[PDB]
Structure formats: structure tokens, C-alpha cells
């Protein structure tokens, strides 16, 4: 297939700004965007890791939404809406 790199930059400045808006943020310093990407990277890494752990223990090659839900659960980030 194709090689994946620097995809974190897929999280555009525009998008991070939109998110801060919903968070009710009026003014955004130039250094926020990269911090944000940092924080997002970590958040995703931790959730995908536990998710995949669940997937492997199921002896599956496909990460299911439930895997992600249990993952989020462990992180104390319970999500409603994908109960399967």
C-alpha cells in the first residue's frame, strides 16, 4: 500500500480554531496549534493502544467500534452512541 507520514498535520489550523470556538475561545496564540497537535497525538495513541489490545485479545484483525468504546471506558472517557 502507501506509506503514511506526518498525518498529524491533517489537523489543520482552521480545524483547531473551530474546536477552540466551540470551547468558547475568542483569541488564539500562534503556539497553540502545535501544542494541540501534541495533545491530540497522545490522546489518540493511548486510546488506539488499548483499543488494539482489546482487538488482539479477541484474535481479530479488525478494530471494532466496541473495542474503541471499551478503550475509552478504561480512559474514563465513556462514550454513548456506538453501543453496536
Amino acid at each position: 500500500r502507501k506509506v503514511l507520514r506526518d498525518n498529524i498535520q491533517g489537523i489543520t489550523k482552521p480545524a483547531i480554531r473551530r474546536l477552540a470556538r466551540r470551547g468558547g475561545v475568542k483569541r488564539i496564540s500562534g503556539l497553540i496549534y502545535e501544542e494541540t497537535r501534541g495533545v491530540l497525538k497522545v490522546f489518540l495513541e493511548n486510546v488506539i493502544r488499548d483499543a488494539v489490545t482489546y482487538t488482539e485479545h479477541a484474535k481479530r484483525k479488525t478494530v471494532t467500534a466496541m473495542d474503541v468504546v471499551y478503550a475509552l471506558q478504561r480512559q474514563g472517557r465513556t462514550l454513548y452512541g456506538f453501543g453496536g
Binding site: 489543520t12 480545524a15 466551540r22 470551547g23 475561545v25 503556539l31 489518540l44 488506539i48
Partner: protein, 99 residues
């Protein structure tokens, strides 16, 4: 004239706006691509249910949106109105995330 709004007027406009909606703010593909990148750096030859990638985005945006809320408080508490990395870090520290 030409016409142009004073700095901040559009921002507040954008806030009022995005707080009324419930759509995702990160583009679908760029984000799916980011998940696949991270995932395969943990285990290879993986596959994802359409919904898993969506459950992840719902989670991430929900997380970030909430972190910015807290960050916004720290800025304000600092007699500022512009959020800075300082704030995001104070937030996460108190949150007990990356203390």
C-alpha cells in the same frame, strides 16, 4: 468603503456559531488517515470498522473541545483573553492528565 468588522467580532460570531452546531470540526479523511498512521505504528495489517474511526473522532473532538474550555478559564484567570500553551498545560496538570 470598504467594510470590515473589528477584530473579535467575527470570533464571537464563530463561537456563537459553533456552539449551536454538533457537527464534527476535523475533516473526515485527514483524521481517518491519522488514526491508521498511529494504529499501524502499534500493530500492522489492521482494519477498522467505519464506526470505530467515527467513535474515535467523536471522542477526540469531545475531548479537545472540553480541554479548550478549561484552557480558556486559565487564560482568563491570568488576566488574559488569548489562550497560550501555558494554559493548556496548567489545565492538563490540574486535570491530573500529564501532572
Amino acid at each position: 468603503k470598504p467594510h470590515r468588522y473589528r477584530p473579535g467580532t467575527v470570533a464571537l460570531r464563530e463561537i456563537r456559531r459553533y456552539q449551536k452546531s454538533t457537527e464534527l470540526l476535523i475533516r473526515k479523511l485527514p483524521f481517518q488517515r491519522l488514526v491508521r498512521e498511529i494504529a499501524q505504528d502499534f500493530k500492522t495489517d489492521l482494519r477498522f470498522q467505519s464506526s470505530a474511526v467515527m467513535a474515535l473522532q467523536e471522542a477526540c473532538e469531545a475531548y479537545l473541545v472540553g480541554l479548550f474550555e478549561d484552557t480558556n478559564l486559565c487564560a482568563i484567570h491570568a488576566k488574559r483573553v488569548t489562550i497560550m500553551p501555558k494554559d493548556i498545560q496548567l489545565a492538563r496538570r490540574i486535570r491530573g492528565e500529564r501532572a
